[PDB]
Amino acid sequence: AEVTQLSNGIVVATEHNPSAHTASVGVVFGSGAANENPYNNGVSNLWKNIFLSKENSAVAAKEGLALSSNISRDFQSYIVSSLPGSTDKSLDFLNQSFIQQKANLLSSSNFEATKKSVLKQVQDFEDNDHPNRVLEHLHSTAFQNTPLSLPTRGTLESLENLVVADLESFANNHFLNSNAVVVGTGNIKHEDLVNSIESKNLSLQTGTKPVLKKKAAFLGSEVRLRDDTLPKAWISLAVEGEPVNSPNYFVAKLAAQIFGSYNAFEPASRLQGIKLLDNIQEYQLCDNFNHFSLSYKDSGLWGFSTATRNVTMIDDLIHFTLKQWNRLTISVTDTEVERAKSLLKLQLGQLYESGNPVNDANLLGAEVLIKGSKLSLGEAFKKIDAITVKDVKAWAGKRLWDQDIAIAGTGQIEGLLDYMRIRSDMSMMRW
Amino acid sequence: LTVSARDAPTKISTLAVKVHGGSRYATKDGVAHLLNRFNFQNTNTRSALKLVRESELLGGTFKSTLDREYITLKATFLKDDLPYYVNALADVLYKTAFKPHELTESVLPAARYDYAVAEQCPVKSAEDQLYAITFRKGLGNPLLYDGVERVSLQDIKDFADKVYTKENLEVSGENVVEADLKRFVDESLLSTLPAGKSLVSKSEPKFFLGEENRVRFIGDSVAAIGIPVNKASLAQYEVLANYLTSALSELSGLISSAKLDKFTDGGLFTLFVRDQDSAVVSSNIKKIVADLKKGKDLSPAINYTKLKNAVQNESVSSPIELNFDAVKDFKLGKFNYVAVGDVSNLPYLDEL
Amino acid sequence: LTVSARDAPTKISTLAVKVHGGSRYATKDGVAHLLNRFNFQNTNTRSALKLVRESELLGGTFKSTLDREYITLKATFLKDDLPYYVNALADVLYKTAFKPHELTESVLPAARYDYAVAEQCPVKSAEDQLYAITFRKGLGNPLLYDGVERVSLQDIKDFADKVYTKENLEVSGENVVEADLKRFVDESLLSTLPAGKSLVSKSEPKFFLGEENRVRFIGDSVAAIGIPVNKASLAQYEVLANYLTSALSELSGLISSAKLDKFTDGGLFTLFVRDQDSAVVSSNIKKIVADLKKGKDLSPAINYTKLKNAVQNESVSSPIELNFDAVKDFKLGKFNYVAVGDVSNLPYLDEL
Amino acid sequence: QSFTSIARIGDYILKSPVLSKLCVPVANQFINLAGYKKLGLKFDDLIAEENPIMQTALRRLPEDESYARAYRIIRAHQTELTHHLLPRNEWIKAQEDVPYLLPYILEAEAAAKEKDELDNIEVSK
Amino acid sequence: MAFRKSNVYLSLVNSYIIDSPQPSSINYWWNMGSLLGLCLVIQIVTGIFMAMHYS
Amino acid sequence: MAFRKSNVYLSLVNSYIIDSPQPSSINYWWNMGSLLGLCLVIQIVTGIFMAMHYS
Ligand code: HEC
Ligand code: HEC
Ligand SMILES: COc1c(O)c(C)c(C/C=C(\C)CC/C=C(\C)CC/C=C(/C)CC/C=C(\C)CC/C=C(\C)CCC=C(C)C)c(O)c1OC
């Protein structure tokens, strides 16, 4: 449970955990899809794909190393996993690919074979992964004409028109030092890694900063992707949430836990202590749903997602759910808040502490990049337990009560009523 | 009644009661399935509802998984609430109500949904076919329930009596203080369980070879090969699996999935080729079989197969570890084949 | 273009156009099925509706059957209206419209119902499995349509072009004056048909042996054996079929059905054991295989197998007739086996 | 009034030998005067079913009892419409007039009451 | 289906007066309702005709 | 479902006045119907009150 981080030339961050069996090293950049443009959208996803290409991947495999990378909105990360002993051979492969081979990975035979893969990849996504496709579109309309609206995997149109020069252009503007953090998780010590790094000098484009832009903003709107040939209806709905490093980051995350997630087929799920289940189970209004409090640097999204085959009662699904959310402003109970506290701790635990160093790396790098440090799991619990009913009520009265929303859906959505109908349910009549 | 553990300064502990009751030991088709689904229902003192409402207020969940050999009752929770989940798991094993209405209202439905999900994924339709033809009645028993042969409430009770005993299970706690764990297991109802016999037979399963099965299916086509491994000859196959599923092998882009299922008395190697049209499936496999018949290895992935076999932190009780740094050559004797999908346009065992 | 006949003083004649277009010649799975179902739909000059309304007023009906080898277009009617049904059958072969809407509205549905009915009778699920494993791609082709591989309106048109030719069909009229029949066939559109090739190959199908398949099913359990016969060695198997299905054999009460399918280039012998519970099926078959391995015959049913093979008055064009009064001893070499139903409680090829 | 409540009072009286000898004979006389047995019905057949508890109960009732309840109810309606009673040898005997649905009704009520309790549990820190 | 079922107006009449499923055992006490409708009509009809001559 | 949907009386109101699916493009010419109901009410109300004083 130690968050160690020191700066010499490069800001090095590590979180050691003795019993681990393995160790992971890599760099995480403070720039992701939210830094691209509508036309070069998909560059970051492309980088990730070449970094994992058959050529580069075969080199580290001989050495007994494994590769992993993830593209997000605010950040990007390249990671190399290894045994606790080869904690040095990872640092060689890292520098070899980001300085020496930052021109060998971009050959006219590799880039074309990779481009052909992300194209079949992103296409496959839009053709079949409906729930994620919808959540991606939710960000698209909620933050339109603003950074957060750009899909992480990029659009098929900005992708097929992307050239090697664009990769370089992006890389030379974001893969800088002042916008980077070298992460090390697994078992290796902070002082073990920091030495192998402060050994090899060379700055490589120092003093350079990435370009700036215009702040992200929420806009009440919707995008309806009707498709009557699909067998279900997938919809996502949300209000403007909380950004990371916000006084209410936790109240919000707790508020989502109150309604939580559900799966109509799993017996135990049907028994949960969520009032909403009394309303939706009578006529079986949906196969599943899940609330969330997504947070980013400039903004966030608080809402839920759901999938259903009861295409003639979608208005009741949406109506009941939004009536429950009304309660957070006027009648949420102590026991509901308490049930949430326990469950939030359990999930926040399983995330920050799993048996996989790669997840730890991403989380560590991402956090240190936005707030210059990581909040310890124990420090979180103290904040979570401190939340009162009054807090939830004040938060909801600001974020949920009579506030614009964003909607997105695909499939048999004829039954999803108009905007103003849904919008009206964000409140209740009173004397 | 082996009680293992392993402490740590983390806040999330995870109790788990492994039991030798999987499909491999199933007396009737899918009975193990039904029982895994019958877990956490009603006990004689606590209802499934109270159990959930309580654990939620504490901060923990339950789950019951079904392997080909095991039936695991896991429980994830906050550290200091250890005894509760020990007695909870204890209660399930010793006194689940088994009410006739719980079968018709919760169990059967949950089970019907399980079979449905699997009936739509062709690779699993294949994996099930491999086991059925290699081990004709041991590990080749149907994993899930489908109603081909009757299974009453009583049959589910009998199988519970056999499987749930002190001599057939093993408590295992991750992120738990062994001192307290052993103390609580003995202080619970675990020790009251009528310790019967252990069905873990050491004699190697009588496997077959050169067998093949073809199943017509509407969806993606899949061709797969199944190879029975030895108790000691499994460490080489493991590197093979990681070799074919890596950047080192040239034909990694020609196969969907490849793995080695490790048991306590041998194992099974599986290779999967999946694609939309039958033509690409027939080619990619006809190439794999040919290139493997002219085997090669040299163990360049000796450090990759060892690294990938370590990322499994839940398996800190795995069999042989250093058997890898030995053999480094692979051939391809007799194996088993299964065609699923566009049958009239798929290879036969012969032309392979 | 062989035009056979046979007059009589009866009032009901029956024209029939046999064609070598069955499943055995099917280019794509079930295409023969679709075409048999597409018959009597719309032609370019007569609608399916007018055809029916007219024939009803005359006094006759149509029907299109599907064999493993043939596709027969039969027509039962009153004697003196002969030319009408000749031109009717002529019109179908030469100019059926094949409108995209007839496929979706009449053909596919009719076909879907056919497959459904057969998917519920286990003996047929078995018979289909026997053929598929003995003749791996000839007569082992799927008899009915099930959508595993695409089949467009065009694919149905191409197959029609091949199969419907003067060199691949044979007119046959029961209770008809051959003089007039030949006169009308030539005076019709039959002779305008672009006479292609005859797909009737004489070379014996390359059959296999010692093959087995098991299919899980919810209903009655069935165990069946399939035996490939020779072009001349089929006359003995015929008496065997009538022997096992008679009062002379002691084990006639232990088998559900037994028969010999006669083709133009060999044949297939089938034996069926069907019952509710798996135990009785396992026994009855394990007994048949044992008693047949210690073969016996003596041909006491030599006059019964000849009498039963004569009651077939529609088959007055059958192959060998006097081959029966020869061989009189049967053994049991290698054969094929299929388990359908309660699989986990049914015999394997081994223990037979 | 719930069946849980009816049972509480009824059992208390049934156990105490003071009331048990005083009441039961009156109750037996009451049941005979009611006359439902002359119509071929068992008391449990008379319980009003239009509520969730009774619907759950009837759903859990084993097949053979269900077909029998059905025959008794239809037979009753037909006799009633004819303004007759069944011939005495067809009347339900006291040994037969068993509370066959009662155990299902009580189980459902407890399940229901528990849920009501759990949905409203307070928490003390 | 029958016209009495498909017509917008006739179906109302069909569901309330023609095909309405009644319990086989109801007695003459269940005849008072219709008698009440009849009374309502008799009151309205005789009332309107007298209203023509009333001041 | 919502109470407005389940109640015997409210569902009528819901299907005719609340959830009734209307073609998105109807113009002000489609507003005359409601205006006709209003007229009918105004005629009945003012008529009954005057009937109280009329001979
Ligand atoms: C205008 C239509 C009209 C309707 C509709 C009507 N009535 Fe009348 N009613 C009258 C008139 C006119 C009188 C005065 C003449 C009379 O005394 O009968 C009257 C008188 C009465 C009287 C006095 C009887 C007496 O002793 O003279 C009663 C009581 C009565 N109505 C009851 C009813 C009932 C109950 C209804 C309806 C359910 C009804 N009315 C409907 C017009 C009507
Ligand atoms: C008793 C209720 C009553 C109803 C219902 C009623 N009216 Fe009248 N109406 C009267 C009375 C009373 C008068 C006489 C007083 C007057 O002249 O306005 C009258 C008079 C009239 C007149 C003469 C107006 C004038 O020049 O004085 C007309 C026209 C008329 N009504 C139309 C209607 C229409 C159209 C309706 C309904 C759609 C209607 N009425 C409904 C009672 C009613
Ligand atoms: C589920 O169980 C049922 C059941 O549902 C029903 C419906 C019935 C049958 C009974 C009924 C349907 C009774 C219904 C009664 C009514 C709908 C009455 C409605 C009342 C009215 C007063 C209508 C209004 C009349 C007028 C406006 C016109 C009268 C005036 C006129 C004609 C003036 C003419 C003028 C001139 C100058 C000629 C049962 O017996 C029954 O038992 C089991």
Ligand SMILES: COc1c(O)c(C)c(C/C=C(\C)CC/C=C(\C)CC/C=C(/C)CC/C=C(\C)CC/C=C(\C)CCC=C(C)C)c(O)c1OC
């Ligand atoms: C499919 O398309 C539609 C559509 O369907 C509808 C419904 C509307 C909306 C319009 C309407 C619903 C109009 C409806 C009108 C009516 C139902 C009127 C019914 C009429 C009556 C006269 C009711 C009768 C009233 C009474 C008996 C009482 C009055 C008397 C009183 C209160 C006396 C009180 C006495 C004392 C002493 C105090 C649309 O605009 C529309 O457009 C697209």
